[PDB]
Design a protein around this ligand. Structure first.
Ligand SMILES: *[C@@H]1O[C@H](CO)[C@@H](O[C@@H]2O[C@H](CO)[C@@H](O[C@@H]3O[C@H](CO)[C@@H](O)[C@H](O)[C@@H]3O)[C@H](O)[C@H]2NC(C)=O)[C@H](O)[C@H]1NC(C)=O
Ligand SMILES: *[C@@H]1O[C@H](CO)[C@@H](O[C@@H]2O[C@H](CO)[C@@H](O)[C@H](O)[C@H]2NC(C)=O)[C@H](O)[C@H]1NC(C)=O
Ligand SMILES: *[C@@H]1O[C@H](CO)[C@@H](O)[C@H](O)[C@H]1NC(C)=O
Ligand SMILES: *[C@@H]1O[C@H](CO)[C@@H](O)[C@H](O)[C@H]1NC(C)=O
Ligand SMILES: [Ca+2]
Ligand SMILES: [Ca+2]
Length: 379
């Protein structure tokens, strides 16, 4: 079952999306640590749980959470940078490790939230099977900052399926991942209560990430259309991801003159998995919608093997996804902190229409040298 801990809470509670949270107390091994309420409630909080209570650590502190050693787990860390016991939140710098994996280092939640124009954030990780029955989560105030403290508002550990296998360049089954982005392309926001697999992932509409002048056209499956998952685990992504899409639209000439373009800020010197979710719910035949996919200006799917969703799936309403790996560094145009995803029709093989489509997108950072931490953004 899920372990969803509100750090510093004094009693169990439920949030706005029906998620049950328990106090952290029984899992925190380090004694005599401060628990404190936030003394300001940002209007953008969707709930006071778990955000209005925190732990404050002025020395290292360790949680020990029981887990099954053979299972992958999602780990979520919830941060609400605000005022706690009168401390300056800008003085908080710390690291977080999950066993031997560094998740965060020199982390400033305040600077990160300021750069995002957010009041709180969640950092989500997928941890490979550990072969240990305890997950140790260690918070370490920065020893480079005399005034540093660590803080944490909530910690979740959720067992999850082995949803990762390989990526078009690589094996990702044993990778430890950070979730960078999770989008329901062309569709509505999906709260965790509506996610598949009991995974309580949030899927966000993709419009804020579109950087082409043309926003394309959004598509929705017919009423009572059924997604026919077949061998794809339903936990991969919920049906509303596949029942909605962004396409370029009905005007093939406009489409051939543009790329549909999404842009994402990420950390340099990592490889990322771009998981593109697809489901054709309008067309019925191969070679009707055939498109090129570019990632950071390089062909991910194109030339003589362009993307054709029905080519991949064999049928209307059958979902799929394709994983593409991209290494991001400064030996690149535009500074090494971005991923661009672009689509445009292919002229290869004389398709019936000239269009492109995407139904969902997830971007995951792969661990390097047992680290996933990047720098704080510019404020
Ligand atoms: C911990 O994180 C903080 C906050 O991200 C780091 O401080 C920031 O460090 C960056 C460099 O990565 C500073 O930017 C640089 O500033 C100088 C002077 O203006 C400029 O010459 C550079 O071109 C660059 O822009 C940034 O200003 C700085 N922020 C603050 C508030 O000082 C810090 O270095 C990290 N590590 C440690 C151990 O403190
Ligand atoms: C769609 O996007 C692709 C990928 O960014 C464009 O092709 C690139 O164009 C840039 C800038 O001229 C070049 O640096 C890359 O070498 C090109 N990549 C490839 C694989 O050709 C493509 O021309 C764009 N199409 C439209 C219609 O804008
Ligand atoms: C990225 O890698 C380069 C080359 O090793 C290094 O010089 C640079 O400091 C790295 N940047 C970050 C943010 O780690
Ligand atoms: C991709 O091409 C565009 C258009 O020429 C350019 O502005 C951008 O810097 C290029 N990006 C990369 C990552 O090379
Ligand atoms: Ca809390
Ligand atoms: Ca969708």
């Amino acid at each position: 079952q899920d372990i969803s801990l509100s750090c510093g809470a004094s009693e169990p509670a439920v949030d706005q999306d029906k998620k049950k949270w328990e106090p952290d107390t029984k899992f925190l091994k380090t004694p005599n640590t401060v628990h404190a309420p936030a003394t300001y409630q940002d209007p953008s909080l969707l709930s006071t749980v778990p955000y209005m209570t925190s732990r404050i650590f002025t020395a290292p502190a360790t949680y020990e959470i029981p887990v099954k050693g053979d299972k992958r787990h999602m780990l979520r860390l919830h941060f609400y940078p605000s005022t706690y016991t009168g401390l300056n939140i800008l003085d908080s710098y710390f690291s977080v490790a999950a066993n031997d994996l560094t998740l965060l280092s020199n982390f400033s939640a305040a600077i990160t939230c300021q750069a995002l124009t957010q009041a709180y954030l969640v950092r989500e990780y997928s941890l490979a099977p550990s072969e240990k029955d305890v997950l140790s989560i260690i918070f370490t105030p920065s020893d480079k900052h005399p005034k540093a403290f660590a803080f944490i508002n909530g910690i979740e550990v959720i067992p999850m399926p082995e949803l990762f296998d390989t990526a078009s360049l690589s094996d990702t089954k044993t990778a430890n991942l950070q979730t960078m982005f999770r989008l329901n392309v062309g569709g509505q926001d999906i709260p965790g209560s509506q996610d598949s697999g009991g995974l309580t992932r949030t899927w966000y509409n993709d419009a804020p990430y579109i950087f082409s002048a043309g926003l394309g056209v959004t598509l929705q499956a017919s009423n009572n259309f059924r997604i026919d998952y077949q061998k794809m685990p339903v936990s991969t992504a919920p049906a509303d991801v596949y029942k909605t899409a962004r396409s370029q639209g009905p005007n093939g000439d406009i489409n051939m003159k543009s790329n549909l373009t999404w842009m994402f800020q990420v950390d340099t010197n990592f490889t990322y998995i771009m998981r593109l979710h697809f489901c054709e719910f309008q067309l019925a035949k191969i070679n009707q919608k055939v498109f090129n996919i570019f990632i950071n200006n390089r062909t991910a799917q194109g030339d003589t093997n362009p993307a054709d969703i029905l080519g991949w799936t064999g049928g209307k309403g059958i979902p799929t996804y394709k994983d593409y790996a991209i290494y991001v560094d400064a030996n690149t145009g535009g500074g090494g902190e971005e991923i661009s995803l672009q689509m445009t029709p292919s002229t290869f093989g004389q398709p019936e229409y000239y269009d492109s489509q995407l139904n969902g997108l997830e971007i995951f950072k792969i661990d390097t040298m047992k680290n996933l931490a990047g720098p704080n953004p510019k404020p």
